Amino acid sequence: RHIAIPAHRGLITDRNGEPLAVSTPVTTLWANPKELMTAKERWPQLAAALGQDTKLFADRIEQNAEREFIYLVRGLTPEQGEGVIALKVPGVYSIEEFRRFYPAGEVVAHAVGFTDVDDRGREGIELAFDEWLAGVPGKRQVLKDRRGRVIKDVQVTKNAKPGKTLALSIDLRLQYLAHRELRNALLENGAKAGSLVIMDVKTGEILAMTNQPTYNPNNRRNLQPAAMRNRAMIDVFEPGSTVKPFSMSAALASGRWKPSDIVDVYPGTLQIGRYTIRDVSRNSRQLDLTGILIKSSNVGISKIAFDIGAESIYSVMQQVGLGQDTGLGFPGERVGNLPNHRKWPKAETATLAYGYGLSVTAIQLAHAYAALANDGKSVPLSMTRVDRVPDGVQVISPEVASTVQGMLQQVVEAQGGVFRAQVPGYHAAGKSGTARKNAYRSLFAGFAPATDPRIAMVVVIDEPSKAGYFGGLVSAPVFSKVMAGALRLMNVPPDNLP
Ligand SMILES: *C(=O)[C@@H]([C@@H]1NC(C(=O)O)=C(S[C@@H]2CN[C@H](C(=O)N(C)C)C2)[C@@H]1C)[C@@H](C)O
Numbered sequence: 001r002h003i004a005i006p007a008h009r010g011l012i013t014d015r016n017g018e019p020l021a022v023s024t025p026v027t028t029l030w031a032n033p034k035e036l037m038t039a040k041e042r043w044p045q046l047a048a049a050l051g052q053d054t055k056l057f058a059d060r061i062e063q064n065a066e067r068e069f070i071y072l073v074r075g076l077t078p079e080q081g082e083g084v085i086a087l088k089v090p091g092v093y094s095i096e097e098f099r100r101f102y103p104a105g106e107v108v109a110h111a112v113g114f115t116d117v118d119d120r121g122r123e124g125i126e127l128a129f130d131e132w133l134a135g136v137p138g139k140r141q142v143l144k145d146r147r148g149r150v151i152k153d154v155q156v157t158k159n160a161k162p163g164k165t166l167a168l169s170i171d172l173r174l175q176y177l178a179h180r181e182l183r184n185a186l187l188e189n190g191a192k193a194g195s196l197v198i199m200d201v202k203t204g205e206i207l208a209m210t211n212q213p214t215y216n217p218n219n220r221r222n223l224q225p226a227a228m229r230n231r232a233m234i235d236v237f238e239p240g241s242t243v244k245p246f247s248m249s250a251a252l253a254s255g256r257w258k259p260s261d262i263v264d265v266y267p268g269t270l271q272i273g274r275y276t277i278r279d280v281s282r283n284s285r286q287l288d289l290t291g292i293l294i295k296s297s298n299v300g301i302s303k304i305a306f307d308i309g310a311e312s313i314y315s316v317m318q319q320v321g322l323g324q325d326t327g328l329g330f331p332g333e334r335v336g337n338l339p340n341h342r343k344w345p346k347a348e349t350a351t352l353a354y355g356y357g358l359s360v361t362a363i364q365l366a367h368a369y370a371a372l373a374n375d376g377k378s379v380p381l382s383m384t385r386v387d388r389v390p391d392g393v394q395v396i397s398p399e400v401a402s403t404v405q406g407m408l409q410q411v412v413e414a415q416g417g418v419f420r421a422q423v424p425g426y427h428a429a430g431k432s433g434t435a436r437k438n439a440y441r442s443l444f445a446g447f448a449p450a451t452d453p454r455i456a457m458v459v460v461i462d463e464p465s466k467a468g469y470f471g472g473l474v475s476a477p478v479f480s481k482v483m484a485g486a487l488r489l490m491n492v493p494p495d496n497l498p
Contacts, residue, residue: 027081
C-alpha cells in the first residue's frame with residue numbers, strides 16, 4: 001500500500017567544512033513478483049544485467065510469487081539504474097535513494113562511523129546524531145488491482161524533509177597528522193594498536209581521535225574485527241603515572257604541601273605492612289614535588305598520599321572526569337571505574353595515588369589534562385564544533401592548576417626529564433606512564449604551549465607480547481611531532497621566546 005520516500009541525510013563536515021559523510025543519490029531496483037511472474041522469459045536478461053545467477057534469481061522470484069514488493073538490487077548509480085529500467089521488464093521499478101560515501105575514509109572512520117543498508121546511523125557520529133542527520137521520510141500510496149497491476153500511484157501521501165548538516169569538532173588536518181604519526185610510531189616500535197586524542201583545552205572540542213588499526217567505511221566486507229574497535233573511547237586501562245599530576249593537585253590544595261617541599265624516597269622501596277611499594281627508577285633519596293614527577297617515584301607519591309588522605313585524591317580524579325561519564329552519548333563509549341572506597345587503607349591509598357587503583361579511557365585522560373591545562377576549568381567534551389563555549393566548572397583552583405602546569409613543564413624541559421616530548425619553538429608539559437589492563441600500554445599525556453596552554457594530547461601505544469615500552473621513549477616522540485604540527489596548523493604563536 002505504501003512505499004517510503006527516503007530523505008536526503010544531513011552532510012557531516014569537519015570543523016572547517018571538509019566533507020566527511022555525504023548522502024549521494026543512488027538508484028535501487030524493486031519488483032512486484034506477481035507481475036514479474038507473467039514475464040518469465042525476461043528473467044535471464046534481468047538476472048544477467050544484475051550480475052546474478054539465473055537459477056538463484058528465478059528461485060528467489062518463485063519463492064516470493066505471492067509478494068508485491070521485493071528488492072532486486074540497492075545502491076546502483078543513476079545511469080546503471082536507468083539501463084536496467086530501459087529493458088522494460090514488467091513489474092520492475094526504480095526508487096531514487098541515498099547512500100553514504102565517506103570522502104576521508106579510514107582517516108576518521110571510528111569518529112564518523114557509518115549507516116546501515118536502510119541509511120540509519122549504525123556507528124559513531126552517524127548513530128549518536130541520527131535524529132539530527134536523518135530527516136523525515138516521505139510516503140507514496142500504491143494502489144493495484146485485486147492482484148498485481150499498478151492501478152494508481154494516485155499521489156505522494158507526504159513529502160520528504162531532508163536531514164540537517166553537522167560540523168564536527170574534528171579538524172581533518174590535525175586528524176590526518178595524528179593518523180600518519182600514530183601509524184609511523186606503531187611501525188617503528190613493532191606495535192599493532194593504539195590511539196591518539198587531541199583536545200582544545202578552552203572549548204572541550206575533540207580536534208582529533210584516531211585509532212589504529214583503522215578501516216575503510218566505504219568497503220566494509222569482512223574486515224579484521226580489531227579494526228572496528230574505537231579504542232580511544234572503548235579501551236579501558238589503569239592510567240598509572242599519568243594521573244600522578246592529579247594526586248599532586250590534591251597535595252597542593254590540601255594546604256600541607258608546596259612544590260619545594262621534600263620527600264625522602266630512598267632506597268626506592270617502601271614497606272607498608274605485608275606490601276612493598278617499588279619505584280622503577282631507584283637512584284634517589286630526597287626529591288622535591290617536581291622531582292617525584294621527573295623520577296616517577298611511586299614511593300614519593302604514596303608518602304604524600306598517606307599525609308593528605310586518599311579522599312582528597314579520589315575527589316580530584318572524580319572532579320576531572322576520570323572513570324566518569326563524558327556526556328558525549330557516543331555509541332559504545334565506556335566509563336571505566338574509579339572506586340569510591342570511602343575509607344582507604346594504606347595499600348589502596350598508594351595504588352590510587354600512582355594510578356593503578358582506577359580504570360579510564362584515553363578520551364577521559366585527555367579531558368582530565370584539558371582541565372589542568374585550562375587553568376583548572378573543565379569544559380564539557382564535544383564531538384561537534386563548539387561556537388558558544390559553555391562556562392564549564394572550576395574543578396581545580398587556578399593557583400594549583402598553574403603550579404602543576406609548571407611542574408609538568410619541568411618534567412619535559414628539566415635536566416633528566418622526558419626530553420623526547422619537547423616541541424621545537426614551544427614550551428611543552430606532560431607526563432609519561434605505563435598503563436595496565438597483564439596487558440600494558442605506553443602513554444604520554446601533555447599539553448602546550450606550556451606557559452599559555454591551547455591543546456591537550458594523549459598518545460596510547462599498545463605493548464605487544466614482551467615489555468620494554470617506556471612511555472618516555474615510545475609515546476613522547478609522537479606527542480612532540482603531533483603537537484608541533486597541531487600548534488602550527490592552529491597558528492599558535494611560539495611561547496619559547498627571549
Ligand atoms: C607509571 O606509569 C610508572 C612509572 N612511570 C614511568 C615514566 O616516567 O614513564 C616509569 S619509567 C622510569 C622513569 N624514567 C625511566 C625511563 O623512562 N627509562 C629509563 C627509559 C624509568 C615508571 C614505569 C609507575 C606506576 O611505576
